[PDB]
Structure 1
Amino acid sequence: FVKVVKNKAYFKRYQVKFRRRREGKTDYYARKRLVIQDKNKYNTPKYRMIVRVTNRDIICQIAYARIEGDMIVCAAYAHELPKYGVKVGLTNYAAAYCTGLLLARRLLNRFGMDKIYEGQVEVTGDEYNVESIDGQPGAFTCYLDAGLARTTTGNKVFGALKGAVDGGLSIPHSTKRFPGYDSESKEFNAEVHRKHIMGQNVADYMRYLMEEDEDAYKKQFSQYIKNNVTPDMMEEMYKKAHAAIRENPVYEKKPKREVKKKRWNRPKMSLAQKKDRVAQKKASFLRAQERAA
């Protein structure tokens, strides 16, 4: 036999980690580097544009760090695009670009910077960045909080970056992780970036398979088929989506129905009951042992 590791001593000496290190979600090292201000700033906020891509969504938030717990100035989600006529592809690069456009215009709408700071309207895909205006209220700036994503070539965060930047935010960035950087040659095809942004990558995959074999097409693209989505319609769909967003991005909340009020969960068991169980078990055991003998 061998020594049991997990004794009392072990648990006494055992340090606990933070809640968000146990759940595996938050990296505190990077949080530290990202978030504090220089002391000579004195209470001047350091904004950060968080981006959290889920299984079936892409959330983009803005946050600044107070001691009580990081305050959100404004927040968007993907599932509002059915209102603006986008039924599917909510975790594609295009819907990332869309979400960045919302975040930008909703924020600028609150701060009263609507006629000023339009940005890139024509989606060429080359480099655009917001020059500050002389004699006017300066540009918004915030630093990117990728979080845990491996900052690899072709990521929906940097898609959302290109979108939100064109919406007009002063985020510093290179174009190196945008799709286009040939690893050998090191040049950037922005038009190919356009292609991914407009969604030809999906159309071309669905044609290649429809040509190849119809059955995979039917297994893969069910809701696409149901909703009568086609290669030709997709581009103008996303383009109208841009125009609708630019015009009226703001969110109106839903009316709360009076709640039914029922407890699905089981409440915690009181003292007297806990005291009773072992009494019944011992008495019942003694009389049952009489049954055995």
Structure 2
Amino acid sequence: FVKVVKNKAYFKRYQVKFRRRREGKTDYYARKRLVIQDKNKYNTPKYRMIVRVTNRDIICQIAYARIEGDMIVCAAYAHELPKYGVKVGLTNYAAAYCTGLLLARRLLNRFGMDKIYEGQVEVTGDEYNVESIDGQPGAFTCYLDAGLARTTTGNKVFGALKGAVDGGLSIPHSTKRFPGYDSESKEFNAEVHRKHIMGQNVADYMRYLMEEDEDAYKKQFSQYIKNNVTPDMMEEMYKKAHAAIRENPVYEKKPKREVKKKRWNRPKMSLAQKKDRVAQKKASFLRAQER
């Protein structure tokens, strides 16, 4: 026949991966090259901005590594943008920029450095990077953490990076992966990037689609219709969201609810129960053989 490959020797010589690698979550190569602090820095924290794009929202965190685990000093989720005025479209480039701005502003406010480092108050899309002013405390510096995301031009992780840079974080970057960089001739214009930041590509798609056919338009934009946002409000709505974020970044935690203590899973069966189970099965089989 065929020599079975997964046998006792195979299993007892098998060597498992790390748990996160087995789940497929993280890349330990870049993990080690990114989070390990230089030894003569002597316990100085090293800061990542972890950016994750989900099927329905955007997660941004600031974290530094410790032996027991990673510490997260601040975090901004995209599903709290309606509180600031973005009703729909929570997983696009504009939403990523907004959540990066919210993360940066909340972190600066928590550190007490928000009056300093206003950043790009009025967005323009071109290259910008904050410089530390003398006498005042230095600018907060972190490094991007994209994870397994493929870092190609026009990525929402770079959208969030631009948002936080405008917020006032001193992150090292180049304007090569921003949308607006042309590959063939190697230039970067700020107007295309600003269109993407304002979501004007989405507005143009809405206009195009509603011009040609309305069945596909109602299919593909439906919550947009329910929250009755027209392609014309996009820019002013995003500007209002930016202003609201920059004027109030502090977070309000949801109140802790009282617990009724209902168990939804099944508790682990005990040794006596399973031994009685096997005895019962044996007895039932013997009885069936008897009849």
TM-score range, shorter chain: over 0.9
Q: Secondary structure of 2:29's partner?
A: helix
Moved more, 266-275 or 94-103: 266-275
Deviations 1:29-80 (A, max 9, x none): 1000001111111111111111011010110001101001011111110111
Q: Secondary structure of 1:79's partner?
A: helix
Q: Secondary structure of 1:138's partner?
A: coil
In the TM superposition, residue 86 of structure 1 has moved relative to its aligned partner by 1.0
Q: Secondary structure of 2:161's partner?
A: helix
Superposition TM-score, scaled by structure 2 size: 0.98
In the TM superposition, residue 286 of structure 1 has moved relative to its aligned partner by 2.0
In the TM superposition, residue 215 of structure 1 has moved relative to its aligned partner by 1.0
Q: Percent identity?
A: 100
* Unaligned runs of at least 5 residues, structure 1: none
Aligned partners of 1:22, 1:144: CA distance in 2, in Å?
24
In the TM superposition, residue 278 of structure 1 has moved relative to its aligned partner by 2.1
Q: Secondary structure of 2:79's partner?
A: coil
Aligned partners of 1:123, 1:134: CA distance in 2, in Å?
25
Aligned partners of 1:97, 1:176: CA distance in 2, in Å?
17
In the TM superposition, residue 269 of structure 1 has moved relative to its aligned partner by 1.0
In the TM superposition, residue 183 of structure 1 has moved relative to its aligned partner by 1.5
> Residue in 2 aligned with 1:127?
127
Q: Secondary structure of 1:44's partner?
A: coil
* Unaligned runs of at least 5 residues, structure 2: none
Deviations 1:204-246 (A, max 9, x none): 1111111111111111111111111111111111111111111
Deviations 1:240-283 (A, max 9, x none): 11111111111111222211111011111111111112222222
In the TM superposition, residue 134 of structure 1 has moved relative to its aligned partner by 1.3
Deviations 1:86-145 (A, max 9, x none): 110100100111001111110100111121110111211111111110122111101111
Aligned partners of 2:24, 2:102: CA distance in 1, in Å?
29
Aligned partners of 1:284, 1:135: CA distance in 2, in Å?
85
> Residue in 1 aligned with 2:79?
79
Q: CA RMSD, aligned part only? A: 1.0
Pairs aligned (count): 291
Q: Secondary structure of 2:261's partner?
A: coil
Superposition TM-score, scaled by structure 1 size: 0.97
Q: Secondary structure of 2:181's partner?
A: coil
